[PDB]
Design a protein around this nucleic acid. Structure first.
Lengths: 222, 53, 167, 148, 185, 51
RNA sequence: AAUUGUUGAAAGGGAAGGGCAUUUGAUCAGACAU
RNA sequence: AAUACUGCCAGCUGGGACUGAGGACUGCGACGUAAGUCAAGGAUGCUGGCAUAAUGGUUAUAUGCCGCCCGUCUUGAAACACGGACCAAGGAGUCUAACGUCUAUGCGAGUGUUUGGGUGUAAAACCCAUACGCGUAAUGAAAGUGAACGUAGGUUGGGGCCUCGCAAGAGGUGCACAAUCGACCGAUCCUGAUGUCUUCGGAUGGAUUUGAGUAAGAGCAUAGCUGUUGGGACCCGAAAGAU
RNA sequence: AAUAUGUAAGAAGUCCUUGUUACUUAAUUGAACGUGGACAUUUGAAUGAAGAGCUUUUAGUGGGCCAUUUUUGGUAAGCAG
RNA sequence: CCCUGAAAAUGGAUGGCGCUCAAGCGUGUUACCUAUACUCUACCGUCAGGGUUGAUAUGAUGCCCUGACGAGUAGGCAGGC
């Protein structure tokens, strides 16, 4: 196979075109995020100016991290944790928010800390602790080629494609989140901010729906 | 429901559109604006304890 | 036979190491090590003595001098981490430093077979020292107590807080 | 052998693979077949359902020689003809020269009718023949001639 | 710790390489391992996996079974593949010419096949004749008909062939088998 | 062989995300939003400051 | 081997023994010498 | 207007600690028109001292912290529960008859030489006739009867193969196996043909009946682990009974 | 009431036509099983599936104890159930 | 909150010392300490998925790549001394 130059040129051209497509898609996604957040802010401002209240839409996804160990767990919460793939003590998973998943979270309330992650939290999670599920093996999300090989069926071509399908619950969110391996997060740097974790966050504890406060905890635990 | 999905699927195929035949769990409610025209909020506070016995 | 020969002898050649990627960029020196700064030696033969920083040598070392007429520290090189950079700067433009490089302090190595080292200075080195120190002494003299200061040797006194002591 | 036995693997283990609570005692459930109508009843009714009791009349001084009657089916009926003559007789299907098969001399008593046979005549000599075996042989074109 | 949802370190449970010191069988296993590695033909995988089966798992396929398989429409000229032993059947009389490939052939079965006009082939010759198993028909002997199987799963109202040593009127057909004596199974 | 973090390694960051270069060039992380001045309604302000 | 004598070393405020880690004393291999 | 608070930056930058796994290139990518360079699929560069008990190992000791006596019965043992003063040697799931599952092997509708004969370099090895044992036929108490309507059947799912197709898939063939509906053999209950030692024969056709059956054989023999039974039966142990 | 609990959420299905029958209906009426034809990527809610299904054989065990909650006998018990 | 109610036998126990705008009680916010837990890395082993015919320093039971996992009496099996 003395002909290597043609193969190199073809591969380089294909990679250049793929990188250009990924760049244009990421630019479109950045424009979309800016447009959505600025539209939400301006809608709030306009309602307040007109004399009303703008009730934001309920968040579409949650991030759920186990907080409890593995010993002495009742069967129903244990099974729900297994179904949410929070096997280890500090594993984490994104979950679409519907009635069924809300009931799931209510069943596993005393063993998880969950909220709605921001784009910053989601992006940092995918970049640092993003791992795939190729051939039942947990491969790291090192290059966009790995993501294109498996999720090219659904149009998820890049890691930012994956982040987009995660942040905006989309047509293939189930497939994207299933492809993402359960994140193994470290303990929160600087502690949990609480003397005792095993009370609901409302009760001055750590578990339960922390909602918007989940970002700080997840960033510390990353 | 089986024949209902049959009817919707036939109609969607005739009109060349997606079927979306699956049910969906209760989705989170979308964003909406609540007016105050004749609905000024009423301030509510706890009630002090008074025995009825 | 006392021990049966193994079926498989491992390969005998030495495999070359892979192409490492550790290209050397020149060392960045902290801003306090401006040439012409009065430093203090914290380790070595001349520990505690104050010297003048002249040139950053080709390798990561600092060429320093007493100047030798005061406190008897000759032209040496030291390491940045082993000196403390005071704020008593002295002008250095009056001396020539291009001659002194890494090869200038070349040690004539003696093999380990000698073992008879139980019992002199280069004349070139003594003349360079006498010219550099005589060129630096005039710069030193322009300020009141710098010569006596360089003759003195640094030493922590009781109650000193190196975390709060300015330099 | 004795080196592959699990006893060698059990050296160093206190109970030697026989448990700590219910140690290997002499005979906890009685000797062999003890308590068939008793504590072993569940096993003896689950795996040997028709054991206890008696069925049928007796036969004093029964001799198996009288009952000697090995059975032979038609598919195997062509085996008693020697191998080399087999194709010669199969090819030459003739009522004039159909082969004689002495099943008794071979060692069989009864000829039964399982399977088919090629459509060639054959004189079969048999102590006993089933109805269907005789029907099949006669349909093929031979004759079942009884002997003794 | 891990909330283990599956039994850890459990073996796949399937035989890999035969549990036999037959050097020639090992050679065939090596050959078809290479073929299954570097060929996308599922025939290679299935024959490699069948090379491992035990004796009770490799029932002897009869030449009568061979003929019945060849009787199938569109499979008259196919090469029959048998990972096992082919046995002579003195019940059939007309046998069709074919190329039968198997590990071991009984003397009678080999004689029958060569007399019919076809030729007997060993699995290495099969590999050199059809690397991807083209025009091949895999046969298999009957598994459920061995003597030991009839006793399996015995219980009441199952009728699974009691393990009685000596069969007779007295043995294992008294009370518990007929309604007059006790009950019925 | 090794897992290099995109966040703390600019090289692998640019590998994973081609948009990172133009993002840094345009300083989109500290974008200056346009200043639009609208005032909340007196009803809202009174309801906020109400007992 | 249990057990005992002498010599030598060491420790020892109502047990001795042990694990992790090092100071101290005694003792010791390998490698540059290629 | 600022600031506090919260949040973001694919903003910059300083100090510290641990790690250096891999070993020709391959891949992704960045800077450069380019050559090439690079922090880009895991450490390199420069320098110093020692080159021997210096590092390290072993051992004794000190110090800091931890450390209950082992085996056994037990829900629970350090137990104020039992055995153990110490040491050397001996010391406890073996063998056999019959076997169950699984596995290896030889032959395979056959299989098993070794009861015996022949032979022998002599308890070895080699050869062999006739039978018998098991299997190729089951069922019934027994008399007895005794397994193809058919391409050894129909339906469903089937690995694999074949045909078409770039593939997705479609069609054909579909062994093994699984479910089911039938056919046949036997038994039980029925129906009772030709006929006739006129009381014998049981043709044909049925049954929410059942049998350890047939439905193009799968067994025999040897060896092995495990398990079962009788044997002293894993080792040691009675009060007793008899001659 | 709460907690627990059964079933279903399709391909072994649905729709159209017409076949078999000794069952059934006054009647091809109906019942069961069928021939042929039609369906899509959402093939009939969510989540997860670490492979799914199946077989043989066999060990030890068959003295239990405690904690939250419900609860019986008892005044109660480191009581008994 | 404190005091009386408040009596048991060897000397004695917020663990001890001891503590009084506490080192007590109630509450709030930070900082900090450390498990064989969590995160990353190395190594050992196991399991699983794979690559490798090229003559072969041979041996395909060999070499190599990827991922996850590792507690345990009775007991089972395997590899070994």
């Amino acid at each position: 196979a003395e002909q290597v130059a043609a193969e190199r040129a073809a591969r380089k051209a294909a990679n250049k075109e793929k990188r250009a497509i990924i760049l244009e898609r990421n630019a479109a996604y950045q424009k979309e995020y800016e447009t959505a957040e600025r539209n939400i802010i301006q809608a709030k401002r306009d309602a307040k100016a007109a004399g009303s209240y703008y009730v934001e839409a309920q968040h579409k996804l949650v991030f759920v991290v186990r907080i409890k160990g593995i010993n002495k767990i009742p069967p129903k919460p244990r099974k729900v944790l297994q179904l949410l793939r929070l096997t280890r003590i500090n594993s984490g998973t994104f979950v679409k928010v519907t009635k069924a998943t809300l009931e799931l979270l209510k069943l596993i309330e005393p063993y998880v800390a969950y909220g709605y992650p921001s784009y910053s939290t989601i992006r940092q999670l995918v970049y640092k602790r993003g791992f795939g599920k190729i051939n039942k093996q947990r491969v790291p999300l090192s290059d966009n080629a790995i993501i294109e090989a498996n999720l090219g069926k659904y149009g998820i071509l890049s890691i930012d494609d994956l982040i987009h399908e995660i942040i905006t619950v989309g047509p293939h969110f189930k497939q994207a989140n299933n492809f993402l391996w359960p994140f193994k997060l470290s303990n929160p740097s600087g502690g949990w901010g609480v003397p005792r974790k095993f009370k609901h966050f409302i009760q001055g504890g750590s578990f339960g729906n922390r909602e918007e406060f989940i970002n700080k905890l997840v960033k510390s635990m990353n | 429901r089986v024949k209902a999905n049959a009817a919707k699927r036939a109609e969607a195929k005739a009109q060349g559109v997606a079927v979306q035949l699956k049910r969906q769990p209760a989705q989170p409610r979308e964003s909406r604006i609540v007016s105050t025209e004749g609905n000024v909020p009423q301030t509510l506070a706890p009630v002090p304890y008074e025995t009825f016995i | 036979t006392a021990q049966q020969a193994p079926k498989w002898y491992p390969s005998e050649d030495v495999a070359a190491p892979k192409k490492t990627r550790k290209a050397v960029r020149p060392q960045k020196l902290r801003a306090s090590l401006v040439p012409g700064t009065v430093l203090i030696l914290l380790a070595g033969r001349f520990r505690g003595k104050r010297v003048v920083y002249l040139k950053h040598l080709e390798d990561n070392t600092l060429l320093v001098t007493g100047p030798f007429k005061v406190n008897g520290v000759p032209l040496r090189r030291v390491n940045a981490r082993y000196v403390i950079a005071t704020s008593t700067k002295v002008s250095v433009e009056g001396v020539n430093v291009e001659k002194f490089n890494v090869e200038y302090f070349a040690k004539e190595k003696l093999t380990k077979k000698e073992k008879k080292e139980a019992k002199e200075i280069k004349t070139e080195r003594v003349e360079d020292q006498k010219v550099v120190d005589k060129a630096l002494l005039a710069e030193i003299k322009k300020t009141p107590l710098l010569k006596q200061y360089l003759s003195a040797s640094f030493s922590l006194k009781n109650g000193d807080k190196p975390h709060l002591l300015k330099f | 052998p004795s080196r592959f036995t699990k006893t060698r693997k059990h050296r160093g283990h206190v109970s030697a693979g026989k448990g700590r609570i219910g140690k290997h005692r002499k005979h906890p459930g009685g000797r062999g077949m003890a308590g068939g109508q008793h504590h072993h009843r569940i096993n003896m009714d689950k795996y040997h359902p028709g054991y206890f009791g008696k069925v049928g009349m007796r036969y004093f001084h029964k001799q198996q020689a009288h009952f000697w009657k090995p059975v032979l089916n038609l598919d195997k009926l062509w085996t008693l003809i020697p191998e080399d003559k087999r194709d010669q007789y199969l090819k030459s299907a003739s009522k004039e020269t159909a082969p004689v098969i002495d099943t008794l001399a071979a060692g069989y008593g009864k000829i039964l009718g399982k399977g088919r046979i090629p459509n060639v005549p054959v004189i079969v000599k048999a102590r006993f023949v089933s109805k269907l075996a005789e029907e099949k042989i006669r349909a093929a074109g031979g004759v079942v001639e009884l002997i003794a | 710790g891990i909330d283990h949802t599956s039994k850890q370190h459990k073996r796949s449970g399937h035989r890999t390489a035969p549990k036999s010191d037959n050097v020639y069988l090992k050679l065939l296993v090596k050959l078809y391992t290479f073929l299954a590695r570097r060929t996308d033909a599922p025939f290679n995988k299935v024959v490699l996996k069948a090379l491992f089966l035990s004796k009770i798992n490799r029932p002897p396929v009869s030449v009568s079974r061979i003929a019945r398989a060849l009787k199938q429409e569109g499979a008259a000229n196919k090469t029959v593949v048998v990972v096992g032993t082919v046995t002579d059947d003195a019940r059939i009389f007309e046998f069709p010419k074919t190329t039968v490939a198997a590990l071991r052939f009984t003397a009678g079965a080999r004689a029958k096949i060569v007399k019919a006009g076809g030729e007997c082939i060993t699995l290495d010759q099969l590999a050199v004749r059809a690397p991807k198993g083209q025009n091949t028909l895999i046969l298999r002997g009957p598994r459920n008909s061995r003597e030991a199987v009839r006793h399996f799963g015995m219980g009441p109202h199952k009728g699974k062939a009691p393990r009685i040593l000596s069969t007779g009127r007295k043995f294992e057909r008294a009370r518990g088998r007929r309604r007059s004596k006790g009950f019925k199974v | 062989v090794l897992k290099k973090n995109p966040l703390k390694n600019k090289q692998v960051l640019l590998r994973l995300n081609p948009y990172a270069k133009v993002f840094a060039a345009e300083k989109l992380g500290s974008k200056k939003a346009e200043k639009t001045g609208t005032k909340p309604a007196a009803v809202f302000t009174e309801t906020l400051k109400h007992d």
